[PDB]
Swiss-Prot record, chain B:
Residues annotated as binding Ca(2+) 2: D121, I122, E124, N141, H142, G145
Positions of the EGF-like domain: 121-163
Residue numbers of the full-length protein present here: 18 to 180 of 686
Effect the entry attributes to changing Y104A: Strongly decreases affinity for MBL2, but not for FCN2
Covalent S-S links between cysteines: C55-C73, C125-C139, C135-C148, C150-C163
Residue positions, PTM (3R)-3-hydroxyasparagine: N141
Gene expressing this chain: MASP2
Name the record gives this protein: Mannan-binding lectin serine protease 2 A chain
Binding site for Ca(2+) 1: E50, D58, D103, S105, N106
Protein species of origin: Homo sapiens (Human)
CUB domain span: 1-120
Highest taxon listed in the record's lineage: Eukaryota
Phenotype when changing P109L: In MASPD; likely benign
Length: 167, 166
């Protein structure tokens, strides 16, 4: 028998150029991260020190999953402003994550940049928000990389893979 | 990547002849084991077995290594007689084996049980309060493992946990 395909350990690290040193001006960097289907990406910062800007129009770290923009980060973790990431965790809405670091023409002070880490994790597609239709008619089974439905005794799974019909 | 392994990441277990009446004098055992790091989560969707004091006649024993996680029988729980309900069970580590034993006979036509299990990554970065952190500075959990990192300015010691200037 062809052995069961297990999870690839997709995880990594991102850091501003020259981290932990000052980061040059007018820098531009982009990273594209993806996890296997059935897996989302979790990312968080261990270090965040950028030029503070009212709407991060100067220096910044933008996180994006597809169209939606997860947040535009900037500012120092030391001053604990509102633009900084802090310890928040970020997740990709699909299985993709796009990160961009943007350094403008000059720095008020010697900002040390940022360091981030990410890791693929299993999406529990059995998880649904309060008041939303349950992912399965009868029973929901989540496993690594996917999920499936099952029926109570006396019933049988419909061709649609969710509906349970009496038998 | 993906750690090569014989057993599937998930599966289903059911008493003989489920959902019908399970034969008498039957004893079956299952061995569930996943790759290093991961652990197994198992739960029952259906549980209908003969009742008995300390589940002596018929039973479903869930053990992980040496420690016996729990023994089950009946349809409901009493004192010294535990019934699964919707509760969840986890393998201490990466190993979990099940045993279903039926004795000579049954008064009522018991339909047995159905169970499902799935492997899930362990968050070794997670620890029971009081215990020291797995890492001195930063803990990174990922599928199948983990590793530590240090604050800027510090470097990780040979032990891959403690951090120090330089
Ligand atoms: Ca600047
Ligand atoms: Ca899943
Ligand atoms: Ca019996
Ligand atoms: Ca892990």
């Amino acid at each position: 028998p062809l052995g069961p395909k297990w999870p690839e350990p997709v995880f990594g690290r991102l850091a501003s150029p020259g981290f932990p040193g000052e980061y040059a001006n007018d820098q531009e960097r982009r990273w594209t991260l993806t996890a296997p289907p059935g897996y989302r990406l979790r990312l968080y910062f261990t270090h965040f020190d950028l030029e503070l800007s009212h709407l991060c129009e100067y220096d910044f770290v933008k996180l994006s999953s597809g169209a939606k923009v997860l947040a535009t980060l900037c500012g120092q973790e030391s001053t604990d402003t509102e633009r900084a990431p802090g310890k928040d965790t970020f997740y990709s809405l699909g299985s993709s994550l796009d990160i961009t670091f943007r350094s403008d023409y000059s720095n008020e002070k010697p900002f040390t940049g940022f360091e981030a880490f990410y890791a693929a994790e299993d999406i529990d597609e059995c998880q649904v928000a309060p008041g939303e239709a349950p992912t399965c008619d009868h029973h929901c089974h989540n496993h690594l990389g996917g999920f499936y439905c099952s029926c109570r005794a006396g019933y049988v799974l419909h061709r649609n893979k969710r509906t349970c019909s009496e038998q």
